[PDB]
Design a protein around this ligand. Structure first.
Ligand SMILES: [Zn+2]
Ligand SMILES: [Zn+2]
Length: 92
């Protein structure tokens, strides 16, 4: 087998700061688009997380602030790459 890996389990992607609410994320919220807030787009790097019940999330920070949507506690663990960036074209 080959040597390494030499890379780290993250990936670079385009991200956005809402100037009206002062948060940074991968996209504006549906409420931020509907109320039509101002935002600045730029590139960043993202971090992947898992909860012990099997629930999942992602942040631009080293840990998310939010409680679990499935069991209601706070037990997020940092996890690695999803083994693919995306599938075929889908949705609208
Ligand atoms: Zn906003
Ligand atoms: Zn959970």
């Amino acid at each position: 087998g080959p040597m390494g890996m030499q890379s780290i389990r993250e990936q670079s992607c385009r991200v956005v700061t809402c100037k009206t609410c002062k948060y940074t994320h991968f996209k504006p919220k549906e409420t931020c688009v509907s109320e039509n807030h101002d935002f600045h787009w730029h590139n960043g790097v993202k971090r992947f997380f898992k909860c012990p019940c099997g629930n999942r999330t992602i942040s631009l920070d080293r840990l998310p602030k939010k409680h679990c949507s499935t069991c209601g506690l706070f037990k997020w663990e940092r996890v690695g790459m999803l083994k693919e960036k995306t599938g075929p074209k889908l949705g609208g």
